[PDB]
């Protein structure tokens, strides 16, 4: 009686994974937009995960009715390798997603993305082939033997891969299935993911929703008068310097030159410059003196807001970065957004981020060099540079999505990984202890709740994948609501 309402539920949720890994995959082969490395591997995933709540319907459904194996030996056999086959792509294709992603990330490469699609399709094929390849002694080992039950004094046909005579070989396959489908693939996952949280991490900040003109008051004009008037300064070309006085990394000493020798000329009273940091203290009163030479010099030796920065960068006309080392250029990136232009030198992340149209260069070091950029902005300046600032906006905001989708992408794969670990560490110990102790026979009520939850925890993880997928993107909701 209740009993034809408790399978009902395992149908629900059965529809539910095989609808939502169909749709994904139907997706990832239809939708242009969505074909990327990263899609194909979770497709790989999909197909994996419908193989697997495939196989599975059949051993539950009959476990549940009736208590002989239905199905014969290829019944016996096929459905350990298909099911195995699964738990490889499953944990193995994690693991290159998460290899993706510190690719894509801590190595971005991608000079001829040409061949990346193809070689997606090559390593997911091998996975496949691999894991079908470590699959294959399921079915050998699994064969069809006559079980008395106790319960019941009958004999029925069972499929049965545990010998009872030789103890040795379960222990080594026990012991190999942790370690190659949970241990090594979730450690070299971890590796992957310290790096890339190490990167995460110089990303933090860039966030395309606060960096925006849209929260700025009035004209670039107007606002950056108001700017120079509450400092005591008359309009003119404004320079902006954000940056920790350091002498090794930050160029606080290469701009502070730069003025000195830009002091000695007529077009220093064009150019009013704002040195915004705390740090070494002889660099600080090196500031400080030119702040009380010049009357075209501000000082800011105080901590302040993301939103304080934010004004600022849209009232200045430049952003000085003269840094003989910046791996990512997160100030450029946040400044050009609100249309300040980038005068900065040509290292590492800075060279990519700025091209001709979208700044000025200088070689590092050279503070001569770095006046003379100072003193070309002055004379663009006579002209107008809405132009160069609306390109400025655009090629910052272009990466600035592509620094968040990705970072979006990593946690979505970490999700996943969680999931699955969750899932799987259950199914993993009770397989080594039965390794061990399956000539014994154990009825303890703990080892049935052990048993029936891993099964359903491992199951959920098939159906969870895709409405997992349906929470953590914009851009797949969509689609997938299209579809229903
Ligand atoms: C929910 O589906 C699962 C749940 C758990 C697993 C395990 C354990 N289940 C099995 O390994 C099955 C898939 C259990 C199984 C074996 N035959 C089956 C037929 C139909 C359904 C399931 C099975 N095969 C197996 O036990 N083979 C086996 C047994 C003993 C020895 N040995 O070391 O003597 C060697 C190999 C645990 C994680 C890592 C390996 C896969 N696999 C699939």
Aim: aromatic letters at 12%; proline letters at 4%; a positive charge.
């Amino acid at each position: 009686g209740i009993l034809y309402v408790i399978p009902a539920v395992y149908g629900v949720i059965i529809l539910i994974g095989l609808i939502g890994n169909i749709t994904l995959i139907k997706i990832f082969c239809t939708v242009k937009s969505m074909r990327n490395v990263p899609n194909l591997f979770i497709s790989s995933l999909a197909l994996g995960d419908l193989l697997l709540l495939i196989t599975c319907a059949p051993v539950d459904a009959s476990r549940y009715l009736a208590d002989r194996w239905l199905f014969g030996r290829i019944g016996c056999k096929l459905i350990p390798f298909i099911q195995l086959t699964s738990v490889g792509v499953k944990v193995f294709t994690l693991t290159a997603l998460s290899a993706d992603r510190y690719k894509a990330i801590v190595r971005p490469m991608d000079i001829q993305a040409s061949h990346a699609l193809m070689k997606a399709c090559l390593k997911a094929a091998f996975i496949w082939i691999i894991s079908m390849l470590l699959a294959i002694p399921e079915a050998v080992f699994s064969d069809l033997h006559p079980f008395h039950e106790e319960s019941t004094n009958q004999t029925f046909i069972s499929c049965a891969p545990y010998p009872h005579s030789n103890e040795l070989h379960p222990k080594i396959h026990s012991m190999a299935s942790f370690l190659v489908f949970y241990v090594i693939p979730l450690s070299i996952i971890s590796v992957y993911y310290y790096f890339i949280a190490k990167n995460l991490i110089q990303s933090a900040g860039i966030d395309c929703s606060f960096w925006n003109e849209s929260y700025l008051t009035g004209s670039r004009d107007e606002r950056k008068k108001s700017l120079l008037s509450k400092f005591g300064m008359d309009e003119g070309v404004t320079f902006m310097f954000i940056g920790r006085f350091d002498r090794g990394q930050k160029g606080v000493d290469v701009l502070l030159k730069a003025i000195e020798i830009l002091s000695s000329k007529k077009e220093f009273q064009e150019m009013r410059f704002i040195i915004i940091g705390k740090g070494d203290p002889e660099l600080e009163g090196w500031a400080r003196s030119l702040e009380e030479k010049h009357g075209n010099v501000k000082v800011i030796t105080e901590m302040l807001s993301r939103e304080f920065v934010r004004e600022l960068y849209g009232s200045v006309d430049f952003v000085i970065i003269p840094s003989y080392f910046e791996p990512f250029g997160l100030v450029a990136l946040e400044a050009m957004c609100l249309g300040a232009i980038p005068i900065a030198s040509a290292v590492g992340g800075l060279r990519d981020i700025i091209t001709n149209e979208t700044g000025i260069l200088v070689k590092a070091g050279d503070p001569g060099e770095l006046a003379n950029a100072i003193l070309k902005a002055l004379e663009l300046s006579r002209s107008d540079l809405s132009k160069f600032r609306e390109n400025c906006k655009k090629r910052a905001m272009s990466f600035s999505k592509q620094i968040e989708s990705e970072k979006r992408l990593a946690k979505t794969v970490l999700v996943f990984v969680g999931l699955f670990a969750f899932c799987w560490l259950p199914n993993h110990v009770i397989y080594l202890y039965r390794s061990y102790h399956y000539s014994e026979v154990d009825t303890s009520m703990l080892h049935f709740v052990t048993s029936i939850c891993a099964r359903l925890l491992a199951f959920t993880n098939s159906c969870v994948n895709p409405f997992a997928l349906y929470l953590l993107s914009k851009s797949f909701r969509k689609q997938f609501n299209t579809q229903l």
